[PDB]
Structure formats: structure tokens, C-alpha cells
Design an enzyme around this catalytic site. Structure first.
Site, short mmCIF file in Angstrom:
data_model
loop_
_atom_site.label_atom_id
_atom_site.label_comp_id
_atom_site.label_asym_id
_atom_site.label_seq_id
_atom_site.Cartn_x
_atom_site.Cartn_y
_atom_site.Cartn_z
N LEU A 81 -7.43 -8.99 11.05
CA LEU A 81 -8.35 -10.34 10.99
C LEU A 81 -7.87 -11.03 11.89
O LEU A 81 -6.82 -11.60 12.37
CB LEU A 81 -8.10 -11.22 9.66
CG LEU A 81 -8.90 -12.32 9.32
CD1 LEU A 81 -10.25 -11.81 8.94
CD2 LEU A 81 -8.26 -12.95 8.25
N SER B 52 2.71 0.19 -13.10
CA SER B 52 2.87 1.36 -11.84
C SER B 52 4.19 0.99 -11.05
O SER B 52 4.73 1.65 -10.45
CB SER B 52 1.51 1.31 -10.98
OG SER B 52 0.46 1.98 -11.75
N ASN C 130 -1.33 5.66 -14.21
CA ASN C 130 -1.85 4.09 -14.23
C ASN C 130 -2.57 3.60 -13.12
O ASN C 130 -3.62 2.93 -13.31
CB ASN C 130 -0.38 3.44 -14.23
CG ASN C 130 0.04 3.27 -15.84
OD1 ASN C 130 0.21 2.43 -16.63
ND2 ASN C 130 0.32 4.65 -16.39
N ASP D 59 -15.68 -8.46 8.52
CA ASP D 59 -15.43 -7.41 7.50
C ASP D 59 -16.04 -7.73 6.17
O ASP D 59 -17.41 -8.44 6.33
CB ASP D 59 -13.93 -7.87 7.00
CG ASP D 59 -13.54 -9.40 6.60
OD1 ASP D 59 -14.67 -9.98 6.11
OD2 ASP D 59 -12.62 -9.70 6.42
N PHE E 11 -2.26 -3.50 2.98
CA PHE E 11 -3.14 -3.61 3.88
C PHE E 11 -4.65 -3.90 3.11
O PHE E 11 -5.25 -5.02 3.41
CB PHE E 11 -3.55 -2.59 4.76
CG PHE E 11 -2.76 -2.56 6.16
CD1 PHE E 11 -1.30 -2.82 6.50
CD2 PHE E 11 -3.41 -2.75 7.33
CE1 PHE E 11 -0.71 -2.83 7.51
CE2 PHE E 11 -3.00 -2.90 8.61
CZ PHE E 11 -1.60 -2.81 8.71
N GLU F 135 -8.56 3.20 6.74
CA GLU F 135 -9.42 2.10 6.92
C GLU F 135 -10.46 2.20 8.05
O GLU F 135 -11.27 1.51 8.18
CB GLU F 135 -8.07 0.68 7.23
CG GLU F 135 -8.86 -0.50 7.59
CD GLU F 135 -9.90 -1.05 6.68
OE1 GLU F 135 -9.65 -0.87 5.56
OE2 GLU F 135 -10.73 -1.88 7.53
O1 LIG Z 1 -3.60 -7.85 3.48
C1 LIG Z 1 -2.86 -7.43 4.28
C2 LIG Z 1 -3.68 -7.21 5.55
O2 LIG Z 1 -5.17 -7.56 5.52
C3 LIG Z 1 -6.06 -7.32 6.49
O3 LIG Z 1 -6.65 -6.17 6.49
C4 LIG Z 1 -7.63 -5.63 5.30
C5 LIG Z 1 -8.70 -6.37 5.12
O4 LIG Z 1 -8.49 -7.64 4.35
C6 LIG Z 1 -9.55 -5.91 4.11
O5 LIG Z 1 -10.94 -6.47 4.09
C7 LIG Z 1 -9.78 -4.45 4.11
O6 LIG Z 1 -10.44 -3.96 2.75
O7 LIG Z 1 -8.49 -3.49 4.45
C8 LIG Z 1 -7.75 -3.99 5.59
C9 LIG Z 1 -6.87 -3.04 5.89
O8 LIG Z 1 -7.11 -1.76 5.08
C10 LIG Z 1 -5.42 -8.08 7.59
O9 LIG Z 1 -6.02 -8.72 8.65
C11 LIG Z 1 -4.25 -7.20 7.89
O10 LIG Z 1 -3.64 -7.63 9.31
C12 LIG Z 1 -3.12 -7.62 6.78
O11 LIG Z 1 -2.08 -6.88 7.02
#
Ligand SMILES: OC[C@H]1O[C@H](O[C@H]2[C@H](O)[C@@H](O)[C@H](O)O[C@@H]2CO)[C@H](O)[C@@H](O)[C@@H]1O
Ligand SMILES: CC(C)CCC[C@@H](C)[C@H]1CC[C@H]2[C@@H]3CC=C4C[C@@H](O)CC[C@]4(C)[C@H]3CC[C@]12C
Ligand SMILES: CC(C)CCC[C@@H](C)[C@H]1CC[C@H]2[C@@H]3CC=C4C[C@@H](O)CC[C@]4(C)[C@H]3CC[C@]12C
Ligand SMILES: CC(C)CCC[C@@H](C)[C@H]1CC[C@H]2[C@@H]3CC=C4C[C@@H](O)CC[C@]4(C)[C@H]3CC[C@]12C
Ligand SMILES: CC(C)NC[C@H](O)COc1cccc2[nH]c3ccccc3c12
Ligand SMILES: *C(=O)CCCCCCCCCCCCCCC
Length: 442
Positions: free
Chosen positions: A233, A318, A333, A221, A305, A212
Site C-alpha cells: 500500500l 486455530s 477450523n 486495491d 499480509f 497475492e
Molecule cells: O495487513 C498487512 C499487509 O497489508 C497490505 O497488503 C495486503 C492488502 O491489504 C490486501 O488488500 C490484499 O488482500 O492482500 C495484500 C497482501 O496479500 C499491506 O500494504 C502490506 O504492506 C502489509 O504487510
């Protein structure tokens, strides 16, 4: 016959130019660029000086000695030349061994990767390496402890045009063990423990830091939302000041949009906590997660995530296969998704992690782990270039003349040539590569 000499001369001349150019370039780059002025790089500089001296003081006369088929520089310089040869090789492996011990303490320290040494202590260790190498190289050669007592040797010693390194067996054994085998065995042992440690640092944080990315400053984002760290977020609001307010409230201070790496990790462990609770509340993920080992659970969290619980809950087939430990079929899959279609590299690494249940897909992803491989390559290359030569020293103590003089000489030149490789191996570093291209007017 003779035209071969010119052609062999030009080749050896390019070898000398290669060694001197590249090592000059390494010294200059560390001495000039403050960014590159680290403890490791001080030892690298010490290593680069030993190779520079090989290129200027050792290799040119060794070359001439072979092409002329006799020594023309006289006995004083033969003995001096010989001493520098042994010194430079000894200092090289002693330094490499110091790098290994230094990296071991750096990587095991709670202030990880910082050397336990200051710049000044590092200079003293370096100085002490050159003194010890001199004490083990110059003393025996200048005190005549190395010499053999048979007539063929005696003739060569007295002969001004003969510069063959005939030694007594006791010296052959003792000098090669103390100068080479001792620091080699230590280096290898200690640096294998550095890799084990490096590998042992791999965990979910590192996994998501690689997959990430860790951002220290607030950013928007893909959906336009204010985010920070490993996709944390802050708010869905278009007000930046609203994100900053949430950030401060989360972190516990006035950040003004900027956080440290360690604070990103704090937020991340909370997000991980949240993800797991969510998984355990989801009827479709709970059985799967419950059944998985710790490493594959990090895999699942990784996906949560990126796509949220719903996105991941939709992998019905899967998930079932994962629950049954039908890893390959799960991978077949998972590879057929919009997920793998959009983020293939990341998906490749997570799926493979579902396949093996180890962190192997995340090896040598981190800049710091890449740097450790570079050093490992310097060490391994030195070992492979000199080991054959030093094996033959010992083999000749057991039974002399088993291996031709020309083979033994060639194995020495494989050693010499090694003095030209490290500069090329440092091009693996983005910092040296940037340093060099600046210095070469690019
Ligand atoms: O869905 C759970 C988590 O989502 C966010 O982090 C993501 C984000 O939404 C997405 O745009 C991106 O592609 O990936 C990141 C993480 O790889 C949350 O704000 C996290 O706190 C949550 O756990
Ligand atoms: C007798 C023989 C070995 C001497 C030859 C030494 C050679 C290799 C020396 C002489 C001039 C040197 C160059 C002079 C200036 C620069 C610009 C500098 O910012 C980076 C290194 C670089 C490019 C040097 C590289 C090494 C160099 C080419
Ligand atoms: C020994 C004889 C025969 C060969 C020539 C030796 C030369 C290459 C050696 C002797 C002293 C060495 C210097 C010692 C100290 C430093 C300070 C460091 O921050 C950059 C490298 C630098 C500047 C070294 C460059 C190489 C050097 C000049
Ligand atoms: C007898 C002759 C031919 C041998 C040559 C010895 C020279 C090259 C040795 C002696 C002392 C050594 C220096 C000792 C300490 C340092 C400090 C470090 O920050 C850079 C390397 C540097 C500067 C070493 C480079 C190599 C060095 C200069
Ligand atoms: C042309 C000859 C003189 N070259 C020597 C080698 O490059 C380096 O040799 C050594 C380096 C360090 C320790 C050593 N012990 C020895 C015993 C016999 C021969 C070489 C070495 C030796
Ligand atoms: C940009 O940074 C690169 C330009 C540097 C060019 C410097 C010219 C060096 C001249 C080389 C001649 C020395 C040879 C010595 C042989 C004994």
C-alpha cells in the site's frame, strides 16, 4: 490376413504424418516467433529436427519393411537408413542431456534462468552434438564395425532384400553404452539436481508472489487504495501523484508508477519485516509465531499480509491448536472461515502448508517451475519409450534370443513413436499453445 496390412499401413501412415506435422509445427513456431527464440528452444529445435528426420527418413521405410516382410530399397539404402536411425536417436538423447546441463547452470546462476550460453555458442554446441552423434553412429555402421561374423548374418548382409541389424556383442554393448546409457545417466542425475534447486528457491517471496501476485504498475486495491508489487500500500489518498510521490520515496528514484520485479521484492522484504514486528507486538500472535517453525511462520505472515493482525488474531481456536502442533485440527477450523470461503485456493495452500510444514503446496505454481516440469516430461517420456529397447540389447549380449523378434521390433516402434509426443507435450506451455493456434489459423 491381407486386409490387416492396409489397416496397419494406414495406422503407420498416420504415425508418420503425426511425427512430421507436429515437429514441422514446433520448428516453424520457434523460427517464426521472436518470443520463443531462447537458448532452450534452439535445443528443442535440434530435438525437433532429429524427430523430423525419424518421421521422413526412418519410420516410413521401417513401416514398409514390416508390411512387405522384406527389404526392397537395396543394400546401400539399408546401411544408410540404419545409420540415420542410430544418429537421430543418439542426437536426441545427447540434446536432452545438453538441455539438462544448460538448465542446471541456468537455475544455479546468480543471473538465474538465463543460460550461460549466447545464441551463437548454443548453435556451436548443437552443431557439435550432430557431429559427435554422426561420429558415433555413421562411422561404425559405414566402417562395418557393427557386423557379426556368423553365417546367418553374413547371408543377410550379402542379401539385398534382407535388412536385419545383426551386430557383434562388443558393438551391441559399446554403442548402446556410449550412445544411450552415458547421456541418459547424466541427464537423469543432472535434472534431478535441477528439481532440487527449483524446490529450494521456494520461500516466502515466492509464496506471496503466487498467492497475492506481483504487480509492476500502480493499481487500486479492493478498497480503492493505490497499491504496487505484492499488495504494498502506497497511500490511502485518492491522488495518484501522492502515490507516485510515496513510491519514489520508497524505491529511491522517479518511477512514474512502474517498478521492476526485483524492486517489488525489496519492498516486500520490508513489508515482511514490518509484519513480523507487528506479530511480535501482538499478545495473541506472539506465542503462536514463537512456537512455529520457519515455513509455518511464512504461513502466518501470509495470512497477516491478507487480513492484518486483527483479522488473524480472531482465529482464537486455530491459533491455540497451531501453538500445540495440532495441525489437522487447526486445518479443520481454518477451513471453516470467511477467509477460506472467499479465497479458497489461496487458503487451501496456506492451510495445507500449516499441515505439512513444507513448501509442497507451492510446487509447480510458478511459470518457470511449470516450464521445468515440461522439460522433465520430455526427458522422462524419451526414457520410458527407449529404455525397454536398450535393456533388450544388453540382455541379448548376456543371453541372445531370450525375447522374441516381434517383441524386440515392437519395443523399437515404441521408441520410434516417441518422435510424435514432444509437440503434444509442448502444448503445456502457454507460449507454444499461442504460437500453434496462430499457425493453425485460430
Ligand atoms: O495487513 C498487512 C499487509 O497489508 C497490505 O497488503 C495486503 C492488502 O491489504 C490486501 O488488500 C490484499 O488482500 O492482500 C495484500 C497482501 O496479500 C499491506 O500494504 C502490506 O504492506 C502489509 O504487510
Ligand atoms: C510425405 C509426407 C510426410 C509429407 C506431408 C507433410 C505435411 C505434414 C506438411 C505439408 C504441408 C504442411 C503445412 C503447410 C502450412 C502450414 C501453415 C503453417 O503456418 C503451420 C504449419 C502448416 C500447417 C504445415 C504443417 C505440415 C504440413 C501439413
Ligand atoms: C536428411 C534427409 C534425409 C531428410 C530431410 C532433412 C531436413 C528435414 C533437414 C535438413 C536441414 C534442416 C534445417 C537446418 C537448419 C534450420 C534452421 C532453423 O532455424 C530452423 C530449422 C532448419 C530450417 C532445419 C529444418 C530441417 C532440415 C531442412
Ligand atoms: C545424413 C542426414 C540424413 C542427417 C540429417 C542431418 C541434419 C538434419 C542435421 C545436420 C546439422 C544439424 C543442424 C546443426 C545446427 C542447427 C542450429 C540450430 O539453431 C537449429 C538446428 C540446427 C539447424 C541443426 C538441425 C539438424 C541438422 C540440420
Ligand atoms: C530397426 C533398427 C535398426 N532400429 C534402431 C533403433 O531405432 C535405434 O538403435 C540404436 C540407437 C542408438 C544406439 C544403438 N546401439 C545399438 C545396438 C544394437 C541395436 C540398436 C542400437 C542402437
Ligand atoms: C492456417 O494457417 C492453416 C491453413 C494452411 C493450409 C495449407 C494447405 C496445405 C496443403 C496440404 C497438402 C500437402 C500434402 C503432401 C503429401 C505428400
Amino acid at each position: 490376413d491381407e486386409v490387416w496390412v492396409v489397416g496397419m499401413g494406414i495406422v503407420m501412415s498416420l504415425i508418420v504424418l503425426a511425427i512430421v506435422f507436429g515437429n514441422v509445427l514446433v520448428i516453424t513456431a520457434i523460427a517464426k516467433f521472436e518470443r520463443l527464440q531462447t537458448v532452450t528452444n534452439y535445443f528443442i529445435t535440434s530435438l525437433a529436427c532429429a524427430d523430423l528426420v525419424m518421421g521422413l527418413a526412418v519410420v516410413p521405410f521401417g513401416a514398409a519393411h514390416i508390411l512387405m516382410k522384406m527389404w526392397t530399397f537395396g543394400n546401400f539404402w539399408c546401411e544408410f537408413w540404419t545409420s540415420i536411425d542410430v544418429l537421430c536417436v543418439t542426437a536426441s538423447i545427447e540434446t536432452l542431456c545438453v538441455i539438462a546441463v544448460d538448465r542446471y547452470f541456468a537455475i544455479t546462476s546468480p543471473f538465474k534462468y538465463q543460460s550461460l550460453l549466447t545464441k551463437n555458442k548454443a548453435r556451436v554446441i548443437i552443431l557439435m552434438v550432430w557431429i559427435v552423434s554422426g561420429l558415433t553412429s555413421f562411422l561404425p555402421i559405414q566402417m562395418h564395425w557393427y557386423r557379426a561374423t556368423h553365417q546367418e548374418a553374413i547371408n543377410c548382409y550379402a542379401e539385398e532384400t534382407c535388412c536385419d541389424f545383426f551386430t557383434n556383442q562388443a558393438y551391441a554393448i559399446a554403442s548402446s553404452i556410449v550412445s544411450f546409457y552415458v547421456p541418459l545417466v547424466i541427464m537423469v542425475f543432472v535434472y534431478s539436481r535441477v528439481f532440487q534447486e527449483a524446490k529450494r528457491q521456494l520461500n516466502i517471496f515466492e509464496m506471496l508472489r503466487i498467492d497475492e501476485g506481483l504487480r509492476l504498475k500502480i493499481y487500486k486495491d479492493t478498497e480503492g487504495y493505490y497499491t504496487i508489487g505484492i499488495g504494498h500500500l502506497l497511500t490511502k489518498s485518492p491522488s495518484l501523484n501522492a502515490a507516485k510521490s510515496e513510491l519514489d520515496k520508497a524505491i529511491g528514484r522517479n518511477t512514474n508508477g512502474v517498478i521492476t520485479k526485483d524492486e517489488a521484492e525489496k519492498l516486500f522484504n520490508q513489508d515482511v519485516d514490518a509484519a513480523v514486528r507487528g506479530i511480535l507486538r501482538n499478545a495473541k500472535l506472539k506465542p503462536v509465531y514463537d512456537s512455529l517453525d520457519a515455513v509455518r511462520r511464512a504461513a502466518l505472515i501470509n495470512m497477516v499480509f491478507q487480513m492484518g493482525e486483527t483479522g488473524v488474531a480472531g482465529f482464537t481456536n486455530s491459533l491455540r491448536m497451531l501453538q500445540q502442533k495440532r495441525w489437522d485440527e487447526a486445518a479443520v477450523n481454518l477451513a471453516k472461515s470467511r477467509w477460506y470461503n472467499q479465497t479458497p485456493n489461496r487458503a487451501k495452500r496456506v492451510i495445507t502448508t500449516f499441515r505439512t510444514g513444507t513448501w509442497d503446496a507451492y510446487k509447480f505454481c510458478l511459470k518457470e517451475h511449470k516450464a521445468l516440469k515440461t522439460l522433465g516430461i520430455i526427458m522422462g517420456t524419451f526414457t520410458l519409450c527407449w529404455l525397454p529397447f536398450f535393456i533388450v540389447n544388453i540382455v541379448h549380449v548376456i543371453q541372445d534370443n531370450l525375447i522374441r523378434k516381434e517383441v524386440y521390433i515392437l519395443l523399437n516402434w515404441i521408441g520410434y513413436v516417441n518422435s510424435g509426443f514432444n509437440p503434444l507435450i509442448y502444448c503445456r506451455s502457454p507460449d507454444f499453445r499461442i504460437a500453434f493456434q496462430e499457425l493453425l489459423c485460430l
